[PDB]
Amino acid sequence: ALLQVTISLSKVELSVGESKFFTCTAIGEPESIDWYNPQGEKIISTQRVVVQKEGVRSRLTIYNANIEDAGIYRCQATDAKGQTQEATVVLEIYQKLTFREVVSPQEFKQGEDAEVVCRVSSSPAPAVSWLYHNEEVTTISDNRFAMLANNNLQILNINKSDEGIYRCEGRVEARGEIDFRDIIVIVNV
Ligand SMILES: *[C@@H]1O[C@H](CO)[C@@H](O)[C@H](O)[C@H]1NC(C)=O
């Protein structure tokens, strides 16, 4: 009685917090259509993770996704005799760029070794760059300046000429994702 079970998408990527749906189509005469999550459990509809069968189709909607929603889902149709067919879909879930507690301005006294703080996160880990504003926002090349392993900007023996606007830029190259925060750096003489 079951000709074919398929899901509209085979693979989908989404960020934590994003919502997505999938449609299972069971051509023929299914008696039941159920979904199983990556933990292997039969999905019982809730407010956040919803299943609805309508004719020979079943829709799974995942609202406000979290990392534990990631993995392979199965749609299993069953006919009246108890024979089953199934299809699968893969959900890949990542974390988009997120800046935390941005502080601006940040003040330093001339001569001290400054650390300009920037806190950005993502999965995979973000690639961070610091840039300096003039007419064009440009990448910094100066021997007193270095990005630290915690993504902050070290400025050795900070001078009044170092005062200005600094851009903390976060990138995830594999997605082409980019975001930034401009930080006013003040040097008290
Ligand atoms: C720091 O400020 C001084 C004072 O004007 C100036 O000579 C210069 O722009 C800065 N020194 C450098 C370039 O490191």
Is 61 buried (19+), middle (13-18) or exposed (0-12) by CB count in 10 A? Answer: middle
Cα–Cα distances in Å, from 123 out to 58, 100, 172? 31, 15, 8
| Residue whose token pair is 């610091």 | 130
DSSP 49: E
Secondary structure in 3-state letters for 140-177: CCCCCEEECCCCCEEECCCCHHHCEEEEEEEEECCCCE
Cis peptide bond upstream of 124, omega within 30: yes
* Residue ranges around ligand 1 (CB below 6 Å): 159-161
Residue among 54, 50, 45, 49 at smallest CA distance from 26? 54
Breaks (C-N over 2.5 A) in the chain follow: none
Distance CA 42, CA 35 (A): 6
Residue 144 backbone zone (phi > 0: left; psi -120 to 50: alpha; other: beta):
alpha
Nearest partner of 169 among 143, 144, 142, 138, judged by Cα: 138
* 141 closest CA partner among 127, 130, 152, 133: 130
CATH code for the structural domain at 1-94: 2.60.40.10
Q: CATH 2.60.40.10 region(s) of the chain?
A: 1-94, 95-189
Token readout for 126 is: 């973000």
Task: With H, G, I as helix, E, B as strand and everything else as coil, classify residue 112.
Answer: coil
Taking CA atoms, 34 is separated from 19, 23, 39, 117, in Å, by 20, 12, 15, 49
- Which tokens sit at 29? 């005469």
138 CA → ligand 1 middle, Å: 20
- Ligand 1, residues 144, 155, 161: which to mutate, most atoms within 8 A of Cβ? 161
What was the elucidation method?
A: X-ray
| Burial (CB count within 10 angstroms: exposed 0-12, middle 13-18, buried 19+), residue 23 | middle
| CA 168 / ligand 1 centre spacing (Å) | 24
DSSP 40: S
Declared resolution, Å: 1.8
Options 2.60.40.10, 1.10.40.30, 3.90.1580.10, 1.10.3720.10; CATH of 95-189: 2.60.40.10
DSSP-derived letter for residue 110 is T
